[PDB]
Design a protein around this ligand. Sequence first.
Ligand SMILES: Nc1ncnc2c1ncn2[C@@H]1O[C@H](COP(=O)(O)OP(=O)(O)OP(=O)(O)O)[C@@H](O)[C@H]1O
Ligand SMILES: [Mg+2]
Lengths: 100, 159
Amino acid sequence: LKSVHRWLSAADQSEVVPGNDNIEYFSINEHGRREENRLRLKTLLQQDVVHETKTSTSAASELTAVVTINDLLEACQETKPSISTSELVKLRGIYDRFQK
Amino acid sequence: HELNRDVQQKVPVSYMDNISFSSLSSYSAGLTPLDIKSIVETARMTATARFYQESKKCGWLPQSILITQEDLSKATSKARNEFSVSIGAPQIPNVTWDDIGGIDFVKGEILDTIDMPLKHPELFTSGMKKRSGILFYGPPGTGKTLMAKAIATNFSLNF
Ligand SMILES: Nc1ncnc2c1ncn2[C@@H]1O[C@H](COP(=O)(O)OP(=O)(O)OP(=O)(O)O)[C@@H](O)[C@H]1O
Ligand SMILES: [Mg+2]
């Protein structure tokens, strides 16, 4: 998870191929609510076929899953059992001699 | 040509290129078990009806049958319920509750289990880390009936 978050911290933005959010003319708003965004999106989708299922953003390698000490010591302290273990040393005590 | 050839009616038929093939592809289509033919024919009927509606010397006659996204939406929603025996459900039983991830920390974490396998952090291996599937105590008394539907519509695609 730490390696993934470091890798995600490298992949943390659209480093290449930003959105082509060019703005055309401010159309003469005699009517309507200047909702140009939907028409622009429909036009660009029709003209470019952005979903042609071939292009990719590829802002990072999708590889090079580096691993390192750097975060391993976040082991900190384990919430282990056997902090008190009298039951389990009595478990050994059953086999103190070879019996059973 | 395939949409036309069987209608002997002289007035041609077409869609118009403001259609969103992408918005059909998932939101309109879900699991639907082919026979999309049924969809397109259901639309073609309804579009023809409004054409013959205006044909009664109404304000104008566009001289072609023109399909529209609204009739596709109506058609697909009908196709999910005319098959009334079907156990399934539409994708959008949710309104005003669009995944308000800032309303609390827990809402700020439901998105983890969907955003990750959406591959936005990585094209995951599909073969290592166990999935962070959620087992929701949530708000124990009431909420849950809504909760899953709310996220499912707004950051996912079916229910
Ligand atoms: N946090 C909330 N904010 C707003 N409305 C809520 C909230 N929690 C519950 N509701 C109301 O109740 C509905 C969702 O909770 P509901 O009472 O239906 O759950 P439930 O039947 O107890 O759930 P379960 O499926 O676990 O039995 C919402 O549609 C809304 O009317
Ligand atoms: Mg309930």
